[PDB]
Every structure is written in C-alpha cells, then in structure tokens.
Design a protein around this ligand. Structure first.
Ligand SMILES: CCCCCCCCCCCCCCC
Ligand SMILES: CCCCCCCCCCCCCCC
Ligand SMILES: CCCCCCCCCCCCCCC
Ligand SMILES: CCCCCCCCCCCCCCC
Ligand SMILES: CCCCCCCCCCCCCCC
Ligand SMILES: CCCCCCCCCCCCCCC
Ligand SMILES: CCCCCCCCCCCCCCC
Ligand SMILES: [Ca+2]
Ligand SMILES: [Ca+2]
Length: 293
C-alpha cells in the first residue's frame, strides 16, 4: 500500500496550502470586524487554533507516562516557531514593530523567563496551574489593550476562518499519517523517526499559516501567531502535561528558548525584524536541531 501513503501525504499538503490562506484571510477580516490589530487576532484566535495539536499531544503522552515527550515537544515547538517559522517570515516580509507590540513582546519574554526558572527542578502540576493562569491573563490583557444582526460579510469571514483551520489541522495529520504509512511500507520505520515526525506535524499549522500571512505582507499577524503559539505551548501544552505527571527538567532547551526570546525582543525594540534577523534565527534553529536531543 505504497500509493496510499503518497495520496495522504500530498492531499495533506493540498489542504495545508489552501487551508492556511483561507485561515489567514478569514482571520484578517475578523480582526477588522472586531476592530483589533492583526497581532491580536494572531496571538489569540489563530494561536489557540493551531496549538491544539500540541495540547492534545502533551496531555495524552504525560497521561500515558511519557512526560519527557510532553515537555520536549512543547519547548521544541517554541524553538521552531522563532527559529524556523519567524525566521522564514522575517525574510519574506520584514517587520517594523510598533512600540505597543514591543510591550507585548517584553511580557512574552518575562513569561518565558518565569517558566524557565520554575522548570529548573522540573514542572509539577502546581507549576502547570500557575502557567495556565498566566496564559489566561495574557490573552485578556492582549485583547483589552488591542480593542476599541447577521452580516453576510461576517458570516463569510467565519466560514473562511473555521474551514481554513480544519484544513490545516486535517491536512497536517494527513501529512504525518501519510508519511508514517510510507515509512512502514518501505520498512524504514524507526520510532525516533516517528516522534520527531509527529512533533514537527504539530508545528506544521503555524508554519503554513505564518508563511501565508507573510506572503500577504501581514507581519503583525505572523509575529502575533509566533508569540501566541509559544505561550500556548508553555501555558497550555506544557501546563496540561504537568497536571497528569511531573515533567522532567529540560534546562538546556529552556536556555536556548530564553536566548532566542531575548533576541526577538531586542530586535523588535531597538531594530527591526527583517532579512538579517531572519537569517540569524534560521542559523540558530539549524544549529539547535544539529546538536540537541
Ligand atoms: C521574574 C521572576 C522569574 C523567576 C521566578 C521564580 C519563582 C520560583 C523561585 C524559586 C524556584 C525554585 C526552583
Ligand atoms: C501576561 C501575564 C503574565 C506576565 C508575565 C508574568 C511573569 C511572572
Ligand atoms: C475584556 C476582554 C476579555 C477577552 C476574553 C477573551 C477570552 C479569555
Ligand atoms: C481549567 C482546568 C484546570 C484543571 C486543573 C487540574 C489540576 C489537576 C491536579 C492533579 C494533582 C494530582 C496530585 C497528586 C499528588
Ligand atoms: C552563544 C549565544 C548566541 C546568542 C545569539 C548571538 C546572535 C549574534 C550576536
Ligand atoms: C551562532 C551563535 C553561537 C551558536 C552556538 C555555537 C556553538 C554551538 C555548540 C554546540 C555543541
Ligand atoms: C545559541 C542559540 C541556538 C542554540 C544553541 C544550542 C547549543 C546546545 C549545546 C548543548 C547541546 C547538548 C545536547
Ligand atoms: Ca502547533
Ligand atoms: Ca518546578
């Protein structure tokens, strides 16, 4: 059943490509409907929508007594979002960050640092409750200072968003399943090849969404999506995972994330996020995947 593997694989790519653009366009219209910035809609609605892969992966794994998976995938996603995802987007469409989104990015940095320190001895279920509460606070705070019948322009906008989200989520796991069915039918099936495949699959929505937005010069949406997804990975995916079981410490990975997060802030505050910032991010991500576990 080789053909099948390819069928799933390319169909998932079809759903990811077209699904992401619909999701982006639908989110862009919604942002204009609720009079909020593209950053806000990306850091909230879009981020939560694309991080639900991680959240379900994390909870299930830790419940099945594999807490290393929950935290590895959570942190690995964050590193990927800044290194790979934001890296490609910054090059495609350079961003000059307004001084009110710089405040949001600084808050993100503080959140990451707070997570890193309390995770030095691993993440307990109490650590998770705390991170989850901060997650909630971030969302409301991001919405508040980003704000202020049955319209066919609104209905069509929500259809674009939802169908788009379904597209990138179904397509992402058709990608993974399609890849796993090929690797099994070619007898090249490792099980570290399956973990990193599934792990990468959960980051596929963010990748395709942020690339689609970058293609339409929506730099705010991309930046918001990256910041929001990372927070949803830590305050959401990692947090829920800690509820079922103590997540062992990943101090080397956290340090990598803090450094990248710090770089992200300094660039947004005192410079820009363009070509050479993106090249640096991609370099760091490539170094990471070449030397980390
Ligand atoms: C801003 C402060 C970031 C660090 C907060 C740490 C809270 C816990 C301190 C004790 C950690 C023991 C492990
Ligand atoms: C947004 C709410 C959290 C801001 C950072 C808190 C770090 C402790
Ligand atoms: C005041 C704005 C509150 C926004 C809440 C969004 C769900 C959490
Ligand atoms: C919004 C949902 C919040 C769910 C919080 C669940 C906390 C579960 C804690 C379980 C602790 C078990 C301790 C055993 C010693
Ligand atoms: C080793 C730490 C590297 C931190 C980023 C450096 C970017 C170029 C300056
Ligand atoms: C690029 C800035 C430095 C990144 C780290 C370089 C050393 C990596 C050592 C891995 C072992
Ligand atoms: C510097 C920013 C990019 C990431 C560098 C990671 C270096 C990790 C070295 C230790 C690897 C232990 C396995
Ligand atoms: Ca994701
Ligand atoms: Ca702890």
């Amino acid at each position: 059943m080789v053909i099948l593997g390819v069928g799933y694989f390319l169909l998932g790519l079809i759903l990811l490509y077209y699904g992401s653009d619909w999701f982006v366009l639908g989110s862009e219209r919604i942002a204009r409907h609720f009079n909020v910035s593209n950053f806000v809609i990306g850091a909230t609605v879009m981020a939560i929508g694309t991080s639900l892969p991680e959240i379900l992966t994390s909870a299930y794994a830790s419940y099945m007594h594999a807490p290393g998976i929950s935290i590895g995938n959570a942190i690995g996603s964050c590193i990927c979002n800044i290194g790979l995802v934001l890296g490609l987007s910054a090059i495609i469409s350079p961003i000059i960050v307004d001084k009110n989104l710089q405040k949001n990015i600084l808050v993100y940095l503080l959140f990451v640092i707070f997570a890193a320190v309390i995770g030095i001895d691993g993440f307990s279920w109490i650590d998770g409750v705390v991170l989850l509460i901060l997650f909630i606070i971030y969302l409301r705070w991001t919405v508040k200072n980003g704000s202020a019948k049955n319209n066919p322009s609104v209905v069509f906008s929500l259809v674009l968003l939802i169908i788009g989200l379904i597209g990138v989520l179904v397509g992402a796991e058709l990608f993974v399943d399609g890849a796993k069915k090929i690797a099994l039918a070619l007898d090249i099936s490792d099980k570290v090849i399956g973990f990193t495949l599934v792990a990468f699959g959960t980051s596929l929505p963010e990748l395709m969404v942020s690339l689609a937005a970058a293609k339409r010069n929506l730099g705010g949406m991309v930046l918001g999506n990256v910041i929001g997804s990372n927070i949803a990975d830590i305050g959401g995916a990692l947090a829920v995972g800690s509820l079922f079981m103590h997540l062992p410490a990943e101090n080397v990975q956290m340090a990598v994330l803090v450094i990248m997060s710090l770089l992200l802030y300094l660039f947004a505050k005192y410079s820009k996020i363009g070509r050479w910032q993106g090249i640096l991010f991609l370099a760091l991500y490539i170094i990471a995947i070449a030397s980390l576990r």
